[PDB]
């Protein structure tokens, strides 16, 4: 399936770069997957005083039965990197909600390793309940700041990311778990550590 929406003003793709810091005002190789349920503009915006890739999402009130159908699914294609000695992939994730009070966002990480069937998914999905947000302090520019980490030794389906396993693509999915979220999302400093 290809999810298709007319393009509008959006940031240039640039070239795949890790760490991805967006400081050149390009997407540094990040783009929607063809199957991403969100196909709206990807722009570089300031978040917490640094350039970040960003998009808006208003999830449907009627939730699809497939829990990724409505999800932003963004991917770094053809980076062809390896984790090396790094145990984690981590990034800054920011929310600027216009609505957020119930259910949760679940953030998943996957990769496309040509040695492992072009898919390997981190076991450690990260759940962000939206009722938790009210009690978090916002950045000065009014964002909720998360630093999300994935232990790359915990992968599904018995697949193993060796130090030298080539990772052709990296994918991040922000799934709506019965939430009322609407607003802006941002990623920055996507890196291994
Ligand atoms: Ca940045």
What can you see in these coordinates?
This is cellulase. Ca(2+) binds at residues 21, 23, 50-51, 188. It is classed as hydrolase. Keywords: beta-jellyroll, cellulose-binding domain, Glycosidase, Hydrolase. With 193 residues, this protein is an all-beta fold. The protein has a single domain (1-193), classed as Jelly Rolls, CATH 2.60.120.260. It contains no helices and eleven strands. The chain has strands at 30-32, 43-47, 50-58, 73-76, 88-99, 104-112, 120-121, 126-129, 144-151, 169-177, 182-192. The strands form two sheets. Strands 1, 4, 6, 7, 8 and 10 form a six-stranded antiparallel beta sheet that branches. Strands 2-3-11-5-9 form a five-stranded antiparallel beta sheet, with no helix packed on it. Strand 2 and strand 3 form a beta hairpin. The chain is globular and about 40 Å long. It binds calcium ion. The site of calcium ion has 7 residues, from strand 3. Residues 21-23, 50-52, 188 line the site of calcium ion (CA).
Strand content: 35-45%
> Which structural class is indicated by helix and strand composition?
mainly beta
CATH architecture: Sandwich
| Named CATH topology | Jelly Rolls
Oligomeric form of this entry? Answer: monomer
- Biggest sheet architecture: 6 strands, antiparallel
